[PDB]
Design a protein around this ligand. Sequence first.
Ligand SMILES: *[C@@H]1O[C@H](CO)[C@@H](O[C@@H]2O[C@H](CO)[C@@H](O)[C@H](O)[C@H]2NC(C)=O)[C@H](O)[C@H]1NC(C)=O
Ligand SMILES: *[C@@H]1O[C@H](CO)[C@@H](O[C@@H]2O[C@H](CO)[C@@H](O)[C@H](O)[C@H]2NC(C)=O)[C@H](O)[C@H]1NC(C)=O
Ligand SMILES: *[C@@H]1O[C@H](CO)[C@@H](O)[C@H](O)[C@H]1NC(C)=O
Ligand SMILES: N=NC(=O)c1ccncc1
Ligand SMILES: [Fe+3]
Ligand SMILES: [Zn+2]
Ligand SMILES: [Zn+2]
Lengths: 335, 6
Amino acid sequence: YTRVVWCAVGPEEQKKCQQWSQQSGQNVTCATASTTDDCIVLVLKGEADALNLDGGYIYTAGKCGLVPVLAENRKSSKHSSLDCVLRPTEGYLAVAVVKKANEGLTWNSLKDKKSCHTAVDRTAGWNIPMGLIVNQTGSCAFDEFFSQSCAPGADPKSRLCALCAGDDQGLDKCVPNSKEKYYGYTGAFRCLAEDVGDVAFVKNDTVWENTNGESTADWAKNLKREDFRLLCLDGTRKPVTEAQSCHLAVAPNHAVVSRSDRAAHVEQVLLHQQALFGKNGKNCPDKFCLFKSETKNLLFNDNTECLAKLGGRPTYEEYLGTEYVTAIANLKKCS
Amino acid sequence: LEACAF
Ligand SMILES: *[C@@H]1O[C@H](CO)[C@@H](O[C@@H]2O[C@H](CO)[C@@H](O)[C@H](O)[C@H]2NC(C)=O)[C@H](O)[C@H]1NC(C)=O
Ligand SMILES: *[C@@H]1O[C@H](CO)[C@@H](O[C@@H]2O[C@H](CO)[C@@H](O)[C@H](O)[C@H]2NC(C)=O)[C@H](O)[C@H]1NC(C)=O
Ligand SMILES: *[C@@H]1O[C@H](CO)[C@@H](O)[C@H](O)[C@H]1NC(C)=O
Ligand SMILES: N=NC(=O)c1ccncc1
Ligand SMILES: [Fe+3]
Ligand SMILES: [Zn+2]
Ligand SMILES: [Zn+2]
């Protein structure tokens, strides 16, 4: 074995990565970059070995020869005697969320409203919704569909960044890392909870984990699920309890990627690392938990039960599924 | 749909 160098995106992932590094006895060390794309560049250069990516990034990195190693696997919906590591991943539900009190709003009245996206180029917050929107409007002007948005990663002086808030000091407005207040699943849902935006494009799981006391964070601790509605593609609205019949698409689970070169070694170390810091892991909660960071989803989504092995040694296209792959392809024609 | 975008 040698060490595995993980790539942390932003200072909060860096700090968490260093805690992990320390606990692993340098078996895992850290490289840090300002963006996911930058981390994908470090891995390509061979300065970093791997990182966990959202589907939209798995596509980007895949075009560059990086490969899926293990996928995030969460609380299995069905009953499974199968170990978490061996269980097939189910994929998460991408949804569009609005305030119940925002009464006139349906999927069909989204034009000129304010939007909250996890980040440009991501599955639930971006590829799915804009793909859908571009298709339905028959126009590639997705930068002008919404009057204003927070879409971390877009031009900071553009409308797509208008609603973004930057860090503590108001710096880094719209950067695609956790320093941006409205970045990622939780940040985009916060953007909605605080009424900065009219709709948030996140995943089903995010609504639940930040409402009804599930989150103690100050902005979320008082949020209640009844106050939110999901927007279905048929123009109707439903309670956040009906994501199964009111989502925009099913999305491929985030997955760890690495140089094909190091795929095997990276997989080795992570299986061992989660046996140590995963859910029910030997040293979690006692010394360190790889899948916790207080609803901030650093390095891995906090709801991750384990990293699962991938059946069929899949290519990035097979991992993502041909439907999602063409979906992304078409949307990129637009740029 | 081919070249690595970097
Ligand atoms: C959407 O998200 C929530 C939370 O991730 C799902 O509920 C978790 O589901 C597990 C297993 O199915 C339960 O054991 C947990 O108690 C639920 N979490 C919470 C915080 O309530 C919910 O099932 C999801 N909905 C769909 C359609 O998948
Ligand atoms: C937007 O529409 C495009 C093209 O109409 C969709 O891409 C097609 O997907 C179907 C269904 O998977 C494939 O059989 C076709 O071969 C694809 N056609 C083209 C032109 O590439 C895409 O599914 C749509 N975008 C989303 C995300 O729904
Ligand atoms: C470090 O890696 C070695 C070699 O695989 C392993 O025996 C040991 O358990 C690891 N230590 C920690 C704390 O990860
Ligand atoms: N990558 N595979 C997935 O996560 C998945 C995609 C679609 N349906 C179920 C699971
Ligand atoms: Fe995602
Ligand atoms: Zn569906
Ligand atoms: Zn295959």
